[PDB]
Amino acid sequence: TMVLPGVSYNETLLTQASNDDPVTMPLFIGYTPPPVTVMQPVSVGSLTQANSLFGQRGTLAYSLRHFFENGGLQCYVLPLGPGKGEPAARLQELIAALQTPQMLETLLADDKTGLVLVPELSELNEVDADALWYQGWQVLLTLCRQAPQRFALLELPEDPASAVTLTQQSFSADQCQRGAAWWPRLETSYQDESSAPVVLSPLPAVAAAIQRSAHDNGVWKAPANIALAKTRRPTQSILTSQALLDNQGVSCNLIRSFVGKGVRLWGCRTLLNEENTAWRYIQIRLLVSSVEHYLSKLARAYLFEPNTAPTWMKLKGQVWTWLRQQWLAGAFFGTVEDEAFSLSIGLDETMTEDDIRHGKMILQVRLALLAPAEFIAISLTLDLRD
Amino acid sequence: AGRFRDQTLYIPIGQRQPECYALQQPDTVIDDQTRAVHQFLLPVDQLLADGTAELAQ
């Protein structure tokens, strides 16, 4: 009478809680779509939550739809405000907002994400464009250098000799180490409210391929050889623009399409164009920072302990156990343990008595990592035999 | 009543071929013998195109 218990119908979202994986968590830093707080990062769960917060049409809204339809697990969005309009002015207030010291108080006091991404620098293609591109990268490459474990996801402009002049620009070695560019911008299958297709940056498709091939295969594998789901084609192929093959700038990653298989990510190699330093190869930078994230989790468990020799060996025994299990899981190179990793805490091994009295506890880890199979050098031998 | 499902589309033989011979960019990277098969395929391409051209007239 008072109540009628029965079967209803509604489209509310139940949601899911905590996907962890802080190292491969993307962070989208576009402008708010036209009641989230103007600065705090917002946990976006499924694609239903991305529409219930941010609508369906925009620039950040299509990048979230292209994130979860490429196999993304969870994303965070850092809003910035209801931007102006006249998009040559939104896109120099975007860079000016990212240079504020209030960006550092939100990225350093975050500890939930690990892939910095601004997908709205793709709008610079419409639009000095070169000046805006270089202080678009270099602002992102310093927010990650400063932060303990963040990786930038960058992109090149479509026009060659504007993407050539960006790679032939000065970036310090410390900064290159942590950030990557994928060149060909993606033509999606989303309508633009008319017959014409929506062209998005490749980077929401990349950040979904990074954290699903780190969830499925492990973060040590590679982010490449991944079929991009809901893309028609990359807007430009490498057979029509032989620029960017000039070996005089930062390493770039190519997104291509094949015949028997679709649009593939076809590279994993950081902005370091150095042949011997193993801080190229994205999965090397993301594996060793996934070991930073856990070994510093059990290090600060033994933090406000005495500096006596028992607590040094309580810490080696826990780190040696964990590193041996990851070697037997396939994460490190080496057919014996002596060439896979090493630990060396001690009083006259790493520390000294002056280091102990200042309250330090210094532990050394050496690692041996795996190399990709980027080139297959087939040979044929006849072997006559009568 | 008419329909007009007609065309002007033609696909040359050289891009039927797999990606170890050609489709390399024009007169920049090929080396005067990878252009020799371009000229080998030119009369065959236009003899295949004349059927399309006569068909559309």
Place this chain on the structure above:
Amino acid sequence: ENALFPAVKDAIVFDALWQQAHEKVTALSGEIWTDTGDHDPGVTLLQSATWNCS
């Protein structure tokens, strides 16, 4: 649809055309162009031209 397609569907489907071309080159040459596998280049060129003819 006066269209010829159910009438000629067993003559334009690239296996009939390829065996007509393959027997033709087997007849014209035949002790000069002896290997006809899918690994000779001229075989691939001719069968691609056959696909465009179909």
Place this chain on the structure above:
Amino acid sequence: DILKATLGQCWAFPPRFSPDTGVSLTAGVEAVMQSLRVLFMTEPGERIMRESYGGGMHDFIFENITDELLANIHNRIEESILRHEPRALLKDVIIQPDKQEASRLRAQITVYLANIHDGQTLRLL
């Protein structure tokens, strides 16, 4: 001369054309080696109406040399010589990473044209 007769004659894999000599032709034992470069440089789907034909080595390009990979390369080579080139057996295929400038896998494929070593006991304990 008889190897040129029994093993067929066909064109060269980079098609070289001249007005003096019409088509350059590889024959005999060189024709079997020419077909093996065709197989592993082709990829399945790249030949129209022949989609089975291909080596398929683009499956292994970002795959971590971890020795699950080197067994997959050994089986893909051995199978594709069975299916598409039964004119040449297989002896052994040895795959090594390049020691200088790594992340290059080098495979030596040895073909044919188609005892327990008792001496080691005198050099052990």
Place this chain on the structure above:
Amino acid sequence: DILKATLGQCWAFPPRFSPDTGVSLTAGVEAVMQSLRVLFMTEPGERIMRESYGGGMHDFIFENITDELLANIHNRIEESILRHEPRALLKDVIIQPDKQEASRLRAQITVYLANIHDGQTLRLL
């Protein structure tokens, strides 16, 4: 346009009639979702000469969320999509009690149109 062709056209579930436009019609992918609201809002016996047709969710209305219930809801949904709606697969159905103002079961039914996660070892002991 082809989804409107392959998936049939039918009327809307609340019958909306106008003198300007005769009957409002749901077509294509929206027609499959319209039929799924019909199935779980119907109850077996409520359609004359069609007594098999119904979702049957009135069986579960005073039943204590104790997780014997949530398996019975999962099987009643999965079976009734098999029997009465084979135009749409089933992906997963997730049932949660409502945290604010409890004694409401919320089921999200996800359909289709019709690997062991190795990364977790680096975040465990």
Place this chain on the structure above:
Amino acid sequence: SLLERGLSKLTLNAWKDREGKIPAGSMSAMYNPETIQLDYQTRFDTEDTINTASQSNRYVISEPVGLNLTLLFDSQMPGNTTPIETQLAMLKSLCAVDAATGSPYFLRITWGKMRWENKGWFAGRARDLSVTYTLFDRDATPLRATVQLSLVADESFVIQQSLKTQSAPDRALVSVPDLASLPLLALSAGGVLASSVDYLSLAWDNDLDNLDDFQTGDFLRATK
């Protein structure tokens, strides 16, 4: 788990017809089996062909999935007050020939979260049953049972027809990728239907103009 810690027993529902229209009795059995077992088996026969080109073996019939399951009843412990003959008057009845029609009862075994062969229930009829009473009383009320059930697969015809239309329902609706071709689009349409869809029929059914008409994102309908 995830809400509470009460047990979920197994329930043996019975019908009379192949479908679920006519319900017979339905019991839930205490003291869960500890172990189930469902055995699949497929019979093959070797081709003794004279031509000796190939070695192969045909597919003849797939034997029905059989389920083995062992129960136990007991009524003398002071929580157990229902006599076990009232609980065995249903297993002996439902796993035997019914008086109405002269057939078995088309049982359906179910457990709270256990998913049988690919469904949430296990249909079928009882091949075997053996009760072996081991303890008694002075007047011999039994009060210890040890039942040894064994069933077969036998699903209904409406469920088996519904699972067939969920795989290749005689239309494909194949999307085209970038850098596509009709021999590849026929292999991707011949895998949705498993019927070798012979590319010249694709360009005729979809009104293609020149065998390369699709443009990287449009769909092609393939029937049979």
